[PDB]
Design a protein around this ligand. Structure first.
Ligand SMILES: NS(=O)(=O)c1cccc(C(=O)CSc2ncccn2)c1
Ligand SMILES: NS(=O)(=O)c1cccc(C(=O)CSc2ncccn2)c1
Ligand SMILES: [Zn+2]
Ligand SMILES: [Zn+2]
Lengths: 259, 261
């Protein structure tokens, strides 16, 4: 599967039936579908300050760049405890640097970070959790152009060692909480899916209301570093526009922690 | 069959209609990064749009939209070939989210969208043979927003409660179709794309007018609530709502504009 051409997103449903099933993400966050829920409590991020003496595997999986995260990282504030598994990014392209997955009032942001967690009270690991009830919880951070961000540079500075699919490098531990915005207590919450194949309708989404900033140069670096193909592919393809279009969202509601 | 909701909705069109997964797909979001002014883009001329009030035209609930048949003497001039009218129809949302245009502008969905469909009659016999052939189709798009009552749109809308179910027809006396067009029709977006409905043929030259028209809250609600996708006999009716396609990726391409910004 890809994001462009014949095996692009309108064809995902052929090999991956859930990509044309229920609860699909991402969506456009707009007033007609929002409802304040005063019961939603702020999340607490535990174990996110990773030891500088430990290291963490960065991988180009052919679709994005992922960081592996340890199952001792947890979020509190959902009904079950959810432990971390990986984080990754979605982005656009230099001529159109508007590649977030979720939109707000129809507007794309430059990019989007996802911090993926699985239900560790119910399930032993992420792979088992991925296609089961209540299995996954993703945190989403919207990214715009702004000031240089030292914390996102903790990922971006390694990008030239993972240029082709399958390549790996280690990244020393850093504080994952520095990737999060201001006032995390304000967010949108809804039931949805993976935004790539296999598109399992098994995800609890929390999209923070406030965006972070990365510089133009950091954004351009991310847009131009990577390839979807293996180092010996005779038809190389750049890793750009790796985001899904927003999905229909009807007779259903997104809940907000802010009124 | 195909729908806009459930197992047969738009993510699964590609399974029965392989062009829906192919190149050049519409609709799109019209936004600054992909727009460029083209000064060679001249006004279209609308000929035979003033339909005979002594003639009647067939309006049809086809299970996916409400469609008005148009005569072959109606046409657009100004493109390389003459394109002759075949039909017009609409796309809308629903009363809880009344934002069902197909094209969007700077991420803005309008309330609804009118399409006036033409075929290249210099090169081909009729619309169905023009359909899957190169530069076979041209479509005019009007973006609709909620506001003032519109007498000309009501020439169509006043029939809606008499075509509520699939297969039903009414007769509409001729009126001036140019009166469905917005102000300053010389200002438009232009690009190569596809039919927005299966079989999604990548054969459409698009013209989307810059300026929206308005219809009243009452007219928009009648459009959103009058009609069903299913036959009159159906024990389980399905409402004809949300009959618009999501915007499509549009990468390394350009939409040209006849107005400058
Ligand atoms: N963009 S996303 O966070 O919804 C996303 C898409 C696909 C996989 C993931 C994961 O974190 C791994 S869960 C998984 N991976 C492969 C196959 C099945 N599930 C996240
Ligand atoms: N929404 S649209 O203007 O792009 C559109 C949708 C569906 C059909 C049509 C036509 O009538 C073109 S002729 C045709 N109709 C159905 C199938 C194939 N060709 C136009
Ligand atoms: Zn993701
Ligand atoms: Zn149409």
């Amino acid at each position: 599967w890809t994001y462009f051409g014949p095996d692009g997103e309108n064809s995902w449903s052929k090999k991956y039936p859930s990509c044309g099933g229920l609860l699909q993400s991402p969506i456009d966050l707009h007033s007609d579908i929002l409802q304040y829920d005063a019961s939603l409590t702020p999340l607490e991020f535990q174990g996110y300050n990773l030891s500088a003496n430990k290291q963490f595997l960065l991988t180009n999986n052919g679709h994005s760049v992922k960081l592996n995260l340890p199952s001792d990282m947890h979020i509190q504030g959902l009904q079950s405890r959810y432990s971390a598994t990986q984080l990754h990014l979605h982005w656009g392209n230099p001529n159109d640097p508007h590649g977030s997955e979720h939109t707000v009032s129809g507007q794309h942001f430059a990019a989007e970070l996802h911090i993926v967690h699985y239900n560790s009270d119910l399930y032993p690991d992420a792979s088992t959790a991925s296609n089961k009830s209540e299995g996954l919880a993703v945190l989403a951070v919207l990214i715009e152009m702004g000031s240089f961000n030292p914390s996102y540079d903790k990922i971006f500075s390694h990008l030239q060692h993972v240029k082709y699919k399958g390549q790996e490098a280690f990244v020393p531990g850093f504080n994952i909480e520095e990737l999060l915005p201001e006032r995390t207590a304000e967010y949108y919450r809804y039931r949805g899916s993976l935004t790539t194949p296999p598109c399992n309708p098994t995800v609890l989404w929390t999209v923070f209301r406030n965006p972070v900033q990365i510089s133009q140069e950091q954004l351009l670096a991310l847009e131009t570093a990577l390839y979807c193909t293996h180092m010996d592919d005779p038809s190389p393809r750049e890793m750009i526009n790796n985001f899904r279009q927003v999905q229909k969202f009807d007779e259903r509601l997104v809940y907000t922690s802010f009124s």
